Every structure is written in structure tokens, then in C-alpha cells.
Design a protein around this ligand. Structure first.
Ligand code: HEC
Ligand SMILES: Brc1ccc2[nH]cc(CCc3ccnc(N4CCOCC4)n3)c2c1
Ligand SMILES: [Cl-]
Ligand SMILES: [Cl-]
Length: 394
């Protein structure tokens, strides 16, 4: 007797299990058990992943409903699962999205400056260097303090909530509420701080006192700061970290991008395509009976959209495991999702990785792992796949 297939399959972010392709071929929508003991449908082909993400009857917000089958426990209040919906309903979507583009004057130069300073300090200290804790994540943290308009020196404390805030846990996490409430109070103080006049929090602070927003809640304004800092920092820091591994593992590509850095954007788009940073499928709750491939998904059932299922699908991306800079469909991957909940920070995420990689290849053209790849320690029961340390030499 075998048990129902359990998800996630592997916390390793350096390789895709051979099992994903066998699943995609034989049963591209398959029943699985999550860590909570709930049943769910795991979707693993490009065609069916797109279908789910583009049909809003597969709901994000309803995943938070009491009594629903769960992928994992909430780490925030349930109303925050509908964060972007709440932002749109408050009339704030255009302003938020404008504040988190990489286009603000001086932003990209700040990113470059920060990356080079981080790398210079690593070089002064001498190999080995930890590219996650001492490059990718500080670069993400500094970027998001700038984007939000908050002091750089506040970044590290906000950052240290994230190893718990983005856990993928069977059960509620008492520390998540402690940190969440503290971080909300911090962001509420930011909104009252007259020195905070730039970035996203500077803009929200003005809109908060504009008569057209007088009935928007102070809680929502604070929540935008906490959620956009955490989602942004965890997503960019984790993506850049595992993209660096994929690059380091490909010396020919490393050398090509070093020699022809105008190809870095195409390279980053392929690194996004092959990225395993998301540790779980994206969850949706069916709000109707909906046919997905050979399965009639029933109202109230949990669906998990496996991003690397779509992104390594050979029917859509031939030779899917190979980084190819001349694909005809290069941004058609699902690294940023698709549909109603397509990532609002996609352009910022791209530029964070492009600038970080550009700076690394210039400063560290000989970069290589300083330990055998199997010695990386992959974080478990987390919403991202990331190595606890990334030791390199150059
Ligand atoms: C500064 C903010 C920010 C940054 C930077 C950002 N994200 Fe997002 N992302 C969000 C938010 C907020 C949402 C939720 C959007 C919604 O629900 O409409 C989201 C949504 C997503 C989704 C879809 C989730 C779903 O269930 O449909 C994916 C996938 C994603 N992000 C990946 C990434 C990746 C990969 C990166 C970086 C390489 C990144 N994000 C960077 C804020 C960000
Ligand atoms: Br938006 C935002 C930002 C910070 C957050 N912290 C806790 C939550 C709620 C759980 C949840 C549900 C659906 N998507 C997400 N994310 C966040 C990670 O990237 C993918 C989209 N998160 C939350 C939501
Ligand atoms: Cl409910
Ligand atoms: Cl500062």
C-alpha cells in the first residue's frame, strides 16, 4: 500500500527532480497531499497552469476561507491574502505600482552602487564569500528600503522577520504574529514620520492626508508597507541567489555574459524561466466545478499551480533545461505568475537581478562555488527554495 503523493517534492533549488517531467507526461493534473494533510490538485503542464491562472474562478482570496483545504497555515491575517484586491478597492493600485517600478531617477544607480560596495567588501575580506547572506539578500534589502523611502538602517530588522514570515508550515506560527504586529507598528510610525517623503511610503503618506483617501484605513496603508517589503525582499533575494548558482554552474554562459553584458537581460529572462525559487505550487481555491484536463475540479477544492511544471514544459520551451538566449517566446514563462495576480514587482525584480549579475561578473569574473554543490543546505518548509549559505571563491 502506497500513500498519496506528497508535496512539495524536493526543497533543492539547484535541480528539478526528474519526477516533474514524468508527472507532466502522465498526469498533468494529479491529486496530492499537502503538509497540512489536505488533498489538492497539482497542475504541472504549461497549458493547464495557464488555464488555472487565467480563470478567476480559481480564487486566490478564497484560499483564506475558514475550513478550506490548506497548502499551509496563514502567516498573516486572512484579509491580507486579498492584499492586492484591497489595494485596488482603495484606489491605490496605480500609485503603488508606479512607486515600485525601477524607473525612479537615481534608483538604478543606487542599485549599482550598492552591489559594487557589497562586492568590494567581500573582495577586501577575501574568499570564501557568502553570496546569499552577504550579497543577494542585503542587495534586496537595500533596494526595498530605497523603494519604500525608509531608512536603510531599518532594513535589517524588517528583514529578520522573513525567515519566519515566509514559512510554509502545517500549523500557525506564533512568532509570525509577533513579528507581523511589530512590523505593522513600524510602518504605521513611518506614515506619521514627517521625514518620510519619498518612495512608496512617502507617497502613501501624502495620499493618506488627501481628501480622496480619507476613508482608507490606516491599517491598509501600514499593511502595504509590510507586505511589499517582505514579498519583494524575499522574492528578489531568493531569485538572485538561485540564479547565481545557475550561472556559476555554467562557466561558458558566465563568460559570455561577462564579455557581452548587453545579453544580461536575455540571460536573466532565461534564469527566471528555469528558476526553482518558489517552493510550492501557487494555491487557488475552486469557486465552481471546472474541467481542467481530465479532472473535473469541484467547488471548494485546492489547486496548486507548479511554476516549474509550466516553465520546464518541452511542449512550450523546447530543450527546457537549457539556457538559450534566442528563444522566440522568452518572456512567456510563468516566473511572475499570470492573469489577475501577475506580479506587480516584475520589472523591479528583473532589474535587481540584472544589476546584481552585471556587478558580480565585473568584480568577480572568476566566480565559482567554494564547496561541492551537494554541500549547500536547502531551507525546508519555506515558501522559497534557498541555500542557507552560498560559499564562493573567485
Ligand atoms: C516590491 C514588490 C515585489 C517584488 C520586487 C516582487 N514581487 Fe512578486 N508579487 C508581489 C505581490 C505584492 C504579489 C501579489 C499580487 C496579487 O496578488 O495580485 C506578487 C505576486 C507574485 C507571483 C504570483 C503569485 C500568485 O499566486 O499568482 C509570483 C509567481 C511572483 N510574485 C514572483 C516574483 C518573483 C520571481 C520576483 C523577483 C524575481 C518577484 N515576485 C518580485 C510583490 C513583489
Ligand atoms: Br502580496 C503578499 C505579500 C506579503 C505577504 N505575506 C503573507 C501573505 C499572504 C499569503 C500569500 C497569498 C498569496 N500570495 C502571496 N504572495 C506573497 C509571495 O509572493 C507571491 C504572492 N502570499 C502575503 C501576501
Ligand atoms: Cl472565512
Ligand atoms: Cl537611509
Amino acid at each position: 500500500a502506497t500513500v498519496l503523493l506528497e508535496v512539495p517534492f524536493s526543497a533543492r533549488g539547484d535541480r528539478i527532480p526528474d519526477a516533474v517531467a514524468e508527472l507532466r507526461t502522465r498526469e498533468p493534473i494529479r491529486k496530492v497531499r499537502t503538509i497540512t494533510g489536505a488533498e489538492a490538485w497539482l497542475v504541472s503542464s504549461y497549458a493547464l497552469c495557464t488555464q488555472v491562472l487565467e480563470d478567476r474562478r480559481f480564487s486566490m482570496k478564497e484560499t483564506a476561507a475558514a475550513g478550506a483545504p490548506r497548502l499551509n497555515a496563514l502567516t498573516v491575517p486572512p484579509e491580507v491574502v486579498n492584499n492586492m484586491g484591497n489595494i485596488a478597492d482603495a484606489g491605490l493600485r496605480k500609485a503603488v505600482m508606479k512607486a515600485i517600478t525601477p524607473k525612479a531617477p537615481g534608483l538604478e544607480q543606487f542599485l549599482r552602487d550598492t552591489a559594487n560596495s557589497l562586492l568590494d567588501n567581500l573582495i577586501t575580506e577575501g574568499a570564501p564569500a557568502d553570496l546569499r547572506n552577504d550579497f543577494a539578500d542585503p542587495l534586496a534589502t537595500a533596494l526595498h528600503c530605497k523603494v519604500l523611502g525608509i531608512p536603510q538602517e531599518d532594513g535589517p530588522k524588517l528583514f529578520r522577520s522573513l525567515s519566519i514570515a515566509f514559512m510554509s508550515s502545517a500549523d500557525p506560527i506564533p512568532a509570525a504574529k509577533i513579528n507581523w504586529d511589530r512590523d505593522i507598528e513600524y510602518m504605521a510610525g513611518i506614515l506619521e514620520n514627517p521625514n518620510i517623503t519619498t518612495g512608496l511610503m512617502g507617497e502613501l503618506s501624502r495620499l493618506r492626508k488627501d481628501p480622496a483617501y480619507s476613508h482608507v484605513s490606516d491599517e491598509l496603508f501600514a499593511t502595504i508597507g509590510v507586505t511589499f517589503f517582505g514579498a519583494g525582499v524575499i522574492s528578489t533575494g531568493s531569485f538572485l541567489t538561485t540564479a547565481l548558482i545557475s550561472l556559476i554552474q555554467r562557466p561558458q554562459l558566465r563568460n559570455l555574459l561577462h564579455e557581452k553584458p548587453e545579453l544580461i537581460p536575455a540571460g536573466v529572462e532565461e534564469l527566471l524561466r528555469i528558476n526553482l525559487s518558489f517552493a510550492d505550487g501557487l494555491p487557488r481555491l475552486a469557486t465552481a466545478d471546472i474541467q481542467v484536463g481530465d479532472v473535473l475540479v469541484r467547488k471548494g477544492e485546492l489547486v496548486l499551480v507548479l511554476l516549474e511544471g509550466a516553465n520546464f514544459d518541452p511542449e512550450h520551451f523546447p530543450n527546457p533545461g537549457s539556457i538559450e538566449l534566442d528563444r522566440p517566446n522568452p518572456t512567456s514563462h510563468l516566473a511572475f505568475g499570470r492573469g489577475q495576480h501577475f506580479c506587480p514587482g516584475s520589472a523591479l525584480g528583473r532589474r535587481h537581478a540584472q544589476i546584481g549579475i552585471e556587478a558580480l561578473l565585473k568584480k568577480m569574473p572568476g566566480v565559482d562555488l567554494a564547496v561541492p554543490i551537494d554541500q549547500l543546505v536547502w531551507r525546508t518548509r519555506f515558501q522559497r527554495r534557498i541555500p542557507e549559505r552560498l560559499p564562493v571563491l573567485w
